[PDB]
Amino acid sequence: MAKQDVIELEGTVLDTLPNAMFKVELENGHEILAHVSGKIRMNYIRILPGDKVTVEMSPYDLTRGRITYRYK
């Protein structure tokens, strides 16, 4: 949405990182280090390279994010 608090972006994950980290590339082709939300850590709703995921990130960051939604 249009916000000034959190920027909601999507990206496509290419690589799997250890410790709930993921290497995801934004729609713009930018690299971001992502973190899956606690629900994805606890619940087997795993992210696979090639998946498109919704990353929430701060306007002061845009290089690190956190995923709450995986595209289904």
Swiss-Prot record:
Primary location class: cytoplasm
Domain of life: Bacteria
Cellular component terms (Gene Ontology): cytosol
Mitochondrion among keywords: no
InterPro entries, sorted: NA-bd_OB-fold, RNA-binding_domain_S1_IF1, S1_domain, TIF_IF1
Gene Ontology MF annotations: ribosome binding; rRNA binding; translation initiation factor activity
SUPFAM superfamilies the UniProt entry points to: Nucleic acid-binding proteins
Domain S1-like: residue ranges: 1-72
Compartment(s): Cytoplasm
Keywords: Cytoplasm, Initiation factor, Protein biosynthesis, RNA-binding, rRNA-binding
Xref: SMART domains: S1
Purpose: One of the essential components for the initiation of protein synthesis. Stabilizes the binding of IF-2 and IF-3 on the 30S subunit to which N-formylmethionyl-tRNA(fMet) subsequently binds. Helps modulate mRNA selection, yielding the 30S pre-initiation complex (PIC). Upon addition of the 50S ribosomal subunit IF-1, IF-2 and IF-3 are released leaving the mature 70S translation initiation complex.
Subunit text: Component of the 30S ribosomal translation pre-initiation complex which assembles on the 30S ribosome in the order IF-2 and IF-3, IF-1 and N-formylmethionyl-tRNA(fMet); mRNA recruitment can occur at any time during PIC assembly.
Family: Belongs to the IF-1 family.
Name of the protein in question: Translation initiation factor IF-1
Species of the source: Staphylococcus aureus (strain Mu50 / ATCC 700699)
Gene from which the chain derives: infA
